[PDB]
Write a protein that binds this ligand. Structure first.
Ligand code: SC4
Lengths: 262, 272
C-alpha cells in the first residue's frame, strides 16, 4: 500500500509501516553520465555497493522549542565509509541520493515536520560583509546546522564568526518559508506518517563537479506545527536521518584531499 | 572551423607498442591523444574550432591610424598608408609571413571646439582622398588636386554613421609580404657608397600611397580640431608560413628591438 515499503541498497535495508508514498524530485531518478553529456575524458570509478548504501547520520531531538535543522549534500556524507574516501581521492564526483527521514511518536502526540530538498541551498550569513561565511562553517558535515527564530548580526570585528544566520520564516535565505513547497518535499505529520522519503537525481549546471567545493542539495527540516503531547510541556522525540548515495562516479584521481577544519 | 573527434574508451595495455616514447630530433610532434597513455571513457565531442579559423581570428576592425586636421598648413593632412603605426593588428598579422585578403575601412570622425567659451562653426564635411603612388599630392587644403577626377574620394558629413569602403587585394605580388629579407637595390662594384644603398627589408619607397584628409568648409577663425580614426578589417583571408609572435617591444617598421628585451618574469623551477 502507500504506507508499507522496503528499500534495499547494497547491504542495507529500510522498512516502514507508515509511509505517505515517496517523492522522486522533479520526476527524475538518479542516473550515470551519458557519453553525449560526458566531459572529463578519463575512466570513472563507480564504487557501486561500497558507496551506494544507507548511511545513518546523527539523530537530532525535536522539542516544543525547536526551530529547524539543515544539512548539505555531499557534505553530510563526507566521512561516511568508502563514499567519503572516493569523494576525497577524486577531483570530480557525482551522485544522487535516497533521503529517508525517520520520526515516530504515538497517537496522542501532534506536530508536523516539513522536509524539503533544495538545489543550490544558499544560506544567509551573520555579518555586514557579503558572502563572508567561511568554508569550515558552511560545511558542518553530518551534524549539519539549525534554523533560528531571528536575525542576529555578528559585531565582533576582532574575531568575526563568519557563520550563517538562517532565520526560519525567511527560509534562511530571504524568501518566505511558506513558498518552500515549490521544492521537492514531504510532510511528517505525526497523526499520519513515520517518515519522509525523497529520491534526488543529480542536479547542477554541469554533468560533474567538485564535491568538496560545491554542495548540490540542501535538506531543510522545519516544524510546521510544533511538537505537543498529552500535557507534558516536556516532550522530546528523536529525528533520525538516513541517506544513501546513488550512481556514484568519480573522475580525476590523485592524492587525497584533507580539508582544513573548525 | 569544425568538429573535434570523440574520445573512444580505452582499457589497459601490456604491449610492444610504445606511443609514449618518441624522438623529437626528427622534427615531428608526437600525435598522442589521452587514450594512448591512460584508460579513457567514451566521450561524444561537441566542441568545435569555429572561432579560431584564420577568418574569425582577423574578423575585427582594428585601429591603424589617427589622422588629425586643425580647421584652425594643418587645414589638411596626409597619412602614408601602413599597418605598422599601431601594434595590435600588426602583431596578429605577423603570426604569418604572407597574406592575401580584401580590406574593409571604417572611419570614425570626431571634432570639438578647443575653446570652452569661444567660436562657432556650422556642420563640417570632410574629404578623404586616396592618392595612389604617382598621383599629385595636395600642397594646399584647396589646390587643384582635390578635384579627384580619378582618385577615389570619400565625403563624410560630421555626425553621420562612420564612413566605410572596401578595397580589393591590391598587391603587385601574389600575396602581401609581412617580411622581406632583402633590399630594393644591389650596390654594384665600383659605385660610390652613396650609390646603390637602400633600407634593409624595404620594397617600394611608396608601397600603397597615402590618404589626404581635409575639411571642405571655409575655415572660420574659430579654433577647431578633428580626428579621423581609421579602422581596418581583413576579410576573405588566406595566410601562409606561421612564425613565432613578437615577444619584445617593436622598434620601428623592421624587426629591430632595443628596449624590453627581458620579457619573462622569475619563477622557481620547483614552484607551482
Ligand atoms: C599585409 O597587410 C596590409 C596590406 C596592405 C594594406 O594597405 C593597402 C592599401 C592600399 C590602398 C588603400 C586605399 O584605400 C582607400 C581608398 Cl581606395 C579610398 C578611400 C580610403 C581608402 Cl583607406 C588602402 C590600403 C594594409 Cl593597411 C595592410
Amino acid at each position: 500500500s502507500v504506507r508499507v515499503m522496503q528499500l534495499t541498497l547494497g547491504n542495507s535495508t529500510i522498512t516502514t509501516q507508515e509511509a505517505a508514498n515517496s517523492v522522486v524530485a522533479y520526476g527524475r531518478w538518479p542516473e550515470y553520465i551519458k557519453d553525449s553529456e560526458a566531459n572529463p575524458v578519463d575512466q570513472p570509478t563507480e564504487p557501486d555497493v561500497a558507496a551506494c548504501r544507507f548511511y545513518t547520520l546523527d539523530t537530532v531531538t525535536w522539542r516544543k522549542e525547536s526551530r529547524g535543522w539543515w544539512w548539505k549534500l555531499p557534505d553530510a556524507l563526507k566521512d561516511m565509509g568508502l563514499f567519503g574516501q572516493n569523494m576525497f581521492y577524486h577531483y570530480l564526483g557525482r551522485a544522487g541520493y535516497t533521503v529517508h527521514v525517520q520520526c515516530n511518536a504515538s497517537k496522542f502526540h501532534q506536530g508536523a515536520l516539513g522536509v524539503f530538498a533544495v538545489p543550490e541551498m544558499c544560506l544567509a550569513g551573520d555579518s555586514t560583509t557579503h558572502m563572508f561565511t567561511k568554508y569550515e562553517n558552511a560545511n558542518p558535515g553530518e551534524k549539519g546546522g539549525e534554523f533560528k527564530g531571528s536575525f542576529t548580526l555578528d559585531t565582533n570585528a576582532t574575531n568575526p564568526a563568519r557563520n550563517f544566520c538562517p532565520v526560519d520564516y525567511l527560509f534562511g535565505s530571504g524568501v518566505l518559508a511558506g513558498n518552500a513547497f515549490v521544492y521537492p518535499h514531504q510532510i511528517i505529520n505525526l497523526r499520519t506518517n513515520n517518515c519522509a522519503t525523497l529520491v534526488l537525481p543529480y542536479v547542477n549546471s554541469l554533468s560533474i563537479d567538485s564535491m568538496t567545493k560545491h554542495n548540490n542539495w540542501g535538506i531543510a527540516i522545519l516544524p510546521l506545527a510544533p511538537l505537543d503531547f498529552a500535557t507534558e510541556s516536556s516532550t522530546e522525540i528523536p529525528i533520525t536521518l538516513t541517506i544513501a548515495p546513488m550512481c556514484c562516479e568519480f573522475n580525476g584521481l590523485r592524492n587525497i584531499t584533507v580539508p582544513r577544519t573548525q | 572551423a569544425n568538429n573535434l573527434p570523440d574520445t573512444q574508451s580505452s582499457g589497459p595495455a601490456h604491449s610492444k607498442e610504445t606511443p609514449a616514447l618518441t624522438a623529437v630530433e626528427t622534427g615531428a610532434t608526437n600525435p598522442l591523444v589521452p587514450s594512448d597513455t591512460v584508460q579513457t571513457r567514451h566521450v561524444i565531442q561537441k566542441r568545435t574550432r569555429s572561432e579560431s579559423t584564420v577568418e574569425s581570428f582577423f574578423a575585427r576592425g582594428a585601429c591603424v591610424a589617427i589622422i588629425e586636421v586643425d580647421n584652425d598648413s594643418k587645414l589638411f593632412s596626409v597619412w602614408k598608408i601602413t599597418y605598422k603605426d599601431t601594434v595590435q593588428l600588426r602583431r596578429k598579422l605577423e603570426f604569418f609571413t604572407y597574406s592575401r585578403f580584401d580590406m574593409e575601412f571604417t572611419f570614425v570622425v570626431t571634432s570639438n571646439y578647443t575653446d570652452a567659451n569661444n567660436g562657432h562653426a556650422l556642420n563640417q564635411v570632410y574629404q578623404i582622398m586616396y592618392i595612389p603612388p604617382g598621383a599629385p599630392i595636395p600642397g594646399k587644403w584647396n589646390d587643384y588636386t582635390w578635384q579627384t577626377s580619378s582618385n577615389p574620394s570619400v565625403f563624410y558629413t560630421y555626425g553621420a554613421p562612420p564612413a566605410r569602403i572596401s578595397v580589393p587585394y591590391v598587391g603587385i605580388a601574389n600575396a602581401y609580404s609581412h617580411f622581406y629579407d632583402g633590399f630594393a637595390k644591389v650596390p654594384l662594384a665600383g659605385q660610390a657608397s652613396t650609390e646603390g644603398d637602400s633600407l634593409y627589408g624595404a620594397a617600394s619607397l611608396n608601397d600603397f600611397g597615402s590618404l589626404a584628409v581635409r575639411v571642405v568648409n571655409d575655415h572660420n577663425p574659430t579654433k577647431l580640431t578633428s580626428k579621423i580614426r581609421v579602422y581596418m578589417k581583413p576579410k576573405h583571408v588566406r595566410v601562409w608560413c606561421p612564425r613565432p609572435p613578437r615577444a619584445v617591444p617593436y622598434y620601428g617598421p623592421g624587426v629591430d628591438y632595443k628596449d624590453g628585451l627581458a620579457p619573462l618574469p622569475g619563477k622557481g623551477l620547483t614552484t607551482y
